[PDB]
Structures are given as structure tokens and as C-alpha cells.
Design a protein around this ligand. Structure first.
Ligand code: HEM
Length: 153
């Protein structure tokens, strides 16, 4: 459970993300894809991309990055009271996209990395810790829905 102070650190850097959601999404998905190639394989939509330049040029990838970050921002703004937002997501990711919880840990790490590169002044160690907690809560809650559905893992 994040404290109010922690939530404030989280949403303060997230307000910064909102200035350029598309650029953040592309950086995050590209980082995810490059660092963990097995993740790109889950995307029939994007598996034709072989290089970072191709990824950076993809308008559809940028479009999905916005979809992803928009869903995550709505979750973060609920400050833990994200039951309704998390349900559709867990259902599709477990049963439809078949995304292991480990891959959610990978994108969390890509998120934290990109937030740090783009917002050093509002992403000091305290903010990083707070964001990590927020992302851990998200994973924890998603994981519980996965287990229920028979996909824990
Ligand atoms: C911060 C975490 C994530 C969020 C908020 C997020 C959000 C979304 C949203 C909003 C959608 C569209 C609606 C839906 O199908 O539920 C979606 C689709 C999808 N997501 Fe995620 N996602 C996350 C992480 C992941 C990860 C890590 C992977 C893969 C390693 C993944 C794979 C997919 C796939 C394959 C689709 C369908 C893409 C398509 O073909 O249109 N997601 N996600």
C-alpha cells in the first residue's frame, strides 16, 4: 500500500509523461522489445519489426504505446482503487494475449527506465521507489486475477 506521499511522487512524474504520451510509449515498447525480445513475439501486430529504426518509424507502434500508457495512467490515477480498470486488462492479457506476469515486470522496468531518462528532476530515488511500488501493486493485483483464471505465471 503506497502512502499518499508515494502516490504524489508517482502522479507528479506521470503528469510529465502526459506532455508526450506518444514519445514515452514508443521509448517504452522499444526498450521492452530490445531488452526482452520474447515480448515482441507476443505481438503479431509488431513482430515484423526487426530493428530499432523500423520500430521508431512505426506509426502503429506509436499508436499502441499511447493505448498502453493511457490505460496505465488511468490505473495510476486511481491510486490503488483500480479494480474496474484491472479486470478487463487481466482478462485479455491472461486469456487472449497470453502475457506472463514476468513480461509485466519487464515493461515496468522499461517504464521506470524511460521515466528516469526523460524526467531526472522529477524522478529522483524517492520517485523511482514510489513508481516501483505502484508498478508492483499493479502486478500484484493483475497476478491475483491471473491466478483466479488459471494463468498464475
Ligand atoms: C503497463 C502494462 C500494460 C498495459 C497497461 C497494457 C495495456 C493494453 C491495452 C489497453 C490493450 C488494448 C485492450 C486490451 O486488449 O486489453 C493491450 C493490448 C495488447 N497488449 Fe498490453 N498492456 C500492458 C503490457 C503488455 C505486455 C508487457 C505485453 C507483451 C509482452 C502486452 C501485449 C499486448 C498485446 C499482444 C495486445 C494486443 C495488441 C494487438 O494486436 O492489438 N501488453 N494492452
Amino acid at each position: 500500500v503506497l502512502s499518499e506521499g508515494e502516490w504524489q511522487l508517482v502522479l507528479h512524474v506521470w503528469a510529465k509523461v502526459e506532455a508526450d504520451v506518444a514519445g514515452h510509449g514508443q521509448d517504452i515498447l522499444i526498450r521492452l522489445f530490445k531488452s526482452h525480445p520474447e515480448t515482441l513475439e507476443k505481438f503479431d501486430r509488431f513482430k515484423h519489426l526487426k530493428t530499432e529504426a523500423e520500430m521508431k518509424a512505426s506509426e502503429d507502434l506509436k499508436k499502441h504505446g499511447v493505448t498502453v500508457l493511457t490505460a496505465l495512467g488511468a490505473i495510476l490515477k486511481k491510486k490503488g482503487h483500480h479494480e474496474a480498470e484491472l479486470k478487463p486488462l487481466a482478462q485479455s492479457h491472461a486469456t487472449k494475449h497470453k502475457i506472463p506476469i514476468k513480461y509485466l515486470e519487464f515493461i515496468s522496468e522499461a517504464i521506470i527506465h524511460v521515466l528516469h531518462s526523460r524526467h531526472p528532476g522529477d524522478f529522483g530515488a524517492d520517485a523511482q521507489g514510489a513508481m516501483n511500488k505502484a508498478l508492483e501493486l499493479f502486478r500484484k493485483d493483475i497476478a491475483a486475477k491471473y491466478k483466479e483464471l488459471g494463468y498464475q505465471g
